[PDB]
Amino acid sequence: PILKEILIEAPSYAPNSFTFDSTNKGFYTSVQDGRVMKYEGPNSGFVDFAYASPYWNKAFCENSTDAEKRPLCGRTYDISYNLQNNQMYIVDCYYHLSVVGSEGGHATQLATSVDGVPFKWLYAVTVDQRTGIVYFTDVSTLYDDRGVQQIMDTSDKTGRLMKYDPSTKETTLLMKELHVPGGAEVSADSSFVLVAEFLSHQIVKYWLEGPKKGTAEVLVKIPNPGNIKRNADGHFWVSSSEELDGNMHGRVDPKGIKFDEFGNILEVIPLPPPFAGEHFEQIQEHDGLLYIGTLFHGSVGILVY
Numbered sequence: 001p002i003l004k005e006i007l008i009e010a011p012s013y014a015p016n017s018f019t020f021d022s023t024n025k026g027f028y029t030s031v032q033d034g035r036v037m038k039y040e041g042p043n044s045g046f047v048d049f050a051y052a053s054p055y056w057n058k059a060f061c062e063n064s065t066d067a068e069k070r071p072l073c074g075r076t077y078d079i080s081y082n083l084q085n086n087q088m089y090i091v092d093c094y095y096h097l098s099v100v101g102s103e104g105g106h107a108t109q110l111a112t113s114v115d116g117v118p119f120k121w122l123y124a125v126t127v128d129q130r131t132g133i134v135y136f137t138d139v140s141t142l143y144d145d146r147g148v149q150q151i152m153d154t155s156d157k158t159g160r161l162m163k164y165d166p167s168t169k170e171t172t173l174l175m176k177e178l179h180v181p182g183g184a185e186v187s188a189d190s191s192f193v194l195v196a197e198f199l200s201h202q203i204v205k206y207w208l209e210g211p212k213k214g215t216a217e218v219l220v221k222i223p224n225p226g227n228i229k230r231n232a233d234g235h236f237w238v239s240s241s242e243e244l245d246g247n248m249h250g251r252v253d254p255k256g257i258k259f260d261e262f263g264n265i266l267e268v269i270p271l272p273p274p275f276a277g278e279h280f281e282q283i284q285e286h287d288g289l290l291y292i293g294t295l296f297h298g299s300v301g302i303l304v305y
């Protein structure tokens with residue numbers, strides 16, 4: 001059991017998710033100061049790709065580490081490409097669900113609420129390449145970005161799972177009263193969606209098709225599960241930030257856990273330095289590489305394993 005690690009220093013801070021386009025050269029990642037950047041390669045580096053915020057601007061926003069800059073600058077928490085039509089969905093804390101074309105730029109806003117209840121902190125997003133439908137997650141109806149302590153203190157259980165349907169332009173609520181839903185992923189065959197409930201330490205399976213349609217059930221339990229991303233095999237990687245002292249201020253034992261559509265663990269990878277001892281967001285398999293997204297490091301981590 002060998003580990004090779006690549007550390008790519010990013011601009012801004014906190015590259016926390018990734019997605020990949022048809023060309024499949026380099027990658028896209030969202031960062032602290034509101035941008036989604038694109039990595040071309042070593043020589044080429046990172047360039048601006050898109051901004052959720054209508055108002056993102058360089059002088060005021062670039063490389064901010066001030067949280068009271070987020071309401072204007074945005075903070076995007078997840079991005080997912082639609083490969084057939086080269087289009088990128090964005091979920092941003094402050095500018096909610098939007099999309100951008102191949103060309104990047106400021107995103108076009110697509111939804112700010114469901115069932116009359118405004119989104120407070122959109123978090124996870126995924127495109128079902130077969131249907132073109134978008135599944136995403138809102139972590140709270142009360143607290144945003146700068147309210148994490150409250151989320152933990154009240155043990156907030158107002159999270160939501162929605163679908164967006166490009167063709168009808170309709171947002172549909174699929175589940176409510178989720179326990180901090182920090183990850184969501186669609187199955188390869190479009191039959192079910194998975195959501196990680198952070199404070200419940202569980203992956204939940206929601207059926208899109210078949211006799212169990214419209215119903216959910218606990219698929220597997222994992223300590224402090226974050227982002228979930230499907231790989232080419234149709235399996236699922238999720239981040240596990242095991243809080244061994246039962247809260248964010250004690251020891252953390254972060255692992256990437258790969259599982260399958262039947263709740264079987266296939267793989268457990270404990271994170272090496274520098275992610276060891278600390279929470280992380282996402283582990284994503286792509287082309288034999290494992291991308292590590294975090295909310296506290298200034299570098300992309302990639303594991304070869």
Ligand SMILES: NCCc1c[nH]c2ccccc12
Pocket residue numbers: 139148180181182198224225226227239241279280281
């Ligand atoms: N970082 C692992 C998951 C996580 C951390 N902070 C969160 C806040 C809300 C939801 C999930 C998270």
